[PDB]
């Protein structure tokens with residue numbers, strides 16, 4: 164095996180510096196910004212790759228001018244505003260320090276880059292206290308330190324608590340030393356975080372180029388901001404995607420869709436999306452509504468739409484050979500992935516429809532061809548897709564025959580991990596082309612880094628297939644799977660609520676596990692119940708107790724829509740997931756590295772779902788601050804401690820941070836059932852002299868105008884001083900979208916005692932009964948008054964949403 168060895172010279176080309184080392188080897192450092200360094204180590208010095216990055220869309224992160232290199236007798240030095248770089252000459256070693264000269268990131272000995280006949284590896288010093296997070300949608304504990312992980316998009320049904328690899332490959336990790344690494348290679352990469360030795364960690368590939376990006380941040384938020392500068396801002400879903408969604412393996416019929424739609428509405432269980440699974444289509448993959456299964460598909464979609472339901476349909480990436488018309492068409496056009504042994508279309512087995520052709524979404528002409536096929540259901544009013552089985556399915560590491568696949572852009576060993584990625588990109592591109600100024604809904608199984616530009620995600624076929632009742636630990640692991648997916652830029656994520664696997668032979672016995680799965684599930688952005696085949700898992704199937712609890716779980720998510728939607732926008736702007744590992748908000752608190760049983764939803768809410776069988780309590784770690792029970796709003800706790808709370812079956816432990824302001828809407832059966840509604844702001848005043856706020860984001864929820872910053876925002880501020888609370892409703896920040904109106908705001912200030920008076924500006928407001936404050940809340944927009952509820956300990960202040968600044972002063 165070959166190392167860089169001694170560096171004899173350097174050359175600068177603008178923001179790029181190339182160091183020449185032993186036997187034609189070279190290494191480039193490229194300053195994308197003061198914080199982000201592109202590093203390319205090359206065994207032969209040529210700096211070419213078979214394919215340019217599929218993930219990186221921007222390398223200019225604002226670096227100005229040339230890289231300045233200072234030569235010393237035994238080292239070279241490069242300074243940026245945030246970094247100090249030391250390059251040892253003999254032998255080549257790269258070391259990166261922060262501006263205070265603390266070491267962040269160092270090559271291990273002489274083995275910083277290792278080449279062995281095309282196998283490429285990077286070895287880095289591993290510090291005793293260095294922890295690691297990320298690598299996308301992967302199982303096990305949040306903290307990756309001590310374990311090894313592989314990138315090979317795999318199809319592992321009913322996967323275990325530690326199964327790896329899974330369906331997606333996002334080679335972006337973060338270190339507790341406050342940098343991220345994105346290893347910009349699509350082959351079967353492997354990451355070993357001290358799993359081989361305590362002295363070093365490594366990342367490697369069997370082929371391709373050693374190209375990786377070092378992304379410094381002063382915290383994890385900055386690292387993620389740097390990552391989306393490189394790989395793109397997340398697209399937002401249509402607003403209605405943040406409701407509740409329902410699926411089943413057999414959701415492939417008009418009669419059943421009509422039956423289920425009616426049942427949801429009759430039982431007043433809110434729901435926005437009815438999915439259809441893969442059997443909806445006449446064959447793989449013609450996008451024709453199966454004739455026996457749908458009498459009037461247009462009518463169905465419209466009738467469901469009139470009831471507030473949107474429909475999302477499945478697609479697989481293959482054409483069945485039995486689908487003779489489409490297969491022959493595809494094969495004759497050269498649109499199928501080839502077999503290098505024959506030069507002909509690769510002959511792929513598939514679990515349904517017989518052997519198939521794998522559609523080559525890396526071939527440019529395939530895009531418009533697929534686009535025209537997939538548009539058919541969209542012309543009937545379907546709102547998007549779930550793209551399943553793009554690993555491709557049935558192509559795990561041991562299925563070595565797949566390596567014979569030859570795609571337009573390369574061989575399968577290179578293209579496997581971007582097969583689904585390039586498919587998903589086509590789906591979204593073609594959607595944009597044929598459906599003007601509309602947000603796509605796409606939710607995918609297989610993916611690569613950068614997916615956030617095109618698609619959302621779900622965690623595939625989870626749960627226990629031998630006995631559905633034994634899936635508790637698998638359900639529990641969906642917490643860190645989802646948080647890790649979030650850190651890998653899947654902010655719009657869900658899992659199969661109930662799991663995918665296991666026949667439900669006894670609905671009474673399954674009720675507890677279902678209820679807990681849904682309680683967790685409603686705090687995932689794309690909350691979707693689904694199950695294999697004919698195993699019905701709608702929220703009323705588990706008896707009345709479970710139904711009532713599940714209705715309430717779902718109702719809580721709907722009430723929180725304006726809160727959640729504000730964080731959906733924040734995902735677009737900053738890359739931060741809605742579901743946040745506590746470490747993202749409390750990076751200095753090392754206890755957060757251990758937390759696999761709880762998470763933040765945005766910044767204000769801490770959710771700690773019960774995921775243990777028979778449990779009626781929950782252990783919860785509270786980070787810095789003070790924390791209030793969001794269910795009752797009365798019980799308060801000090802931060803930086805472990806507590807145990809009562810958590811019976813009907814209860815989700817949720818806490819609100821003291822100081823928070825939470826926008827909410829009334830219960831509705833689907834998003835926008837009421838196109839205009841009063842917005843309540845639940846305000847939990849912070850400590851004396853501490854100003855807090857929430858910026859309530861709104862936009863049209865459907866178009867791409869938000870990508871051009873067409874929206875409005877309303878900032879609500881709270882600040883307590885001596886026997887006084889000031890609540891400010893900020894002047895509406897108008898950027899080309901006017902909110903639904905006219906409407907009222909209700910400021911709901913949580914307080915121990917009824918105050919003396921409440922003022923709006925200089926003017927004293929009228930105290931009235933709760934009933935009077937509530938009267939004509941959706942019809943009269945001229946009343947400004949306040950009320951007290953002693954039972955709830957809440958001051959309500961009614962005020963029209965005029966769009967103007969208003970200062971509400973509460974005299975304690």
Ligand SMILES: OC[C@H]1O[C@H](OC[C@H]2O[C@H](OC[C@H]3O[C@H](O)[C@H](O)[C@@H](O)[C@@H]3O)[C@H](O)[C@@H](O)[C@@H]2O)[C@H](O)[C@@H](O)[C@@H]1O
Nearest residue numbers: 412413415440441442443515516551623624694695696
């Ligand atoms: O011809 C056999 C069969 O074909 C269709 O059903 C296929 C299949 O559909 C569901 O499973 C699809 C499944 O794909 C991946 O695993 C995803 O990850 C899952 O989310 C997704 O549900 C169903 O669950 C299976 O039971 C079913 O075999 C027709 O619909 C069938 O009528 C027909 O028998």
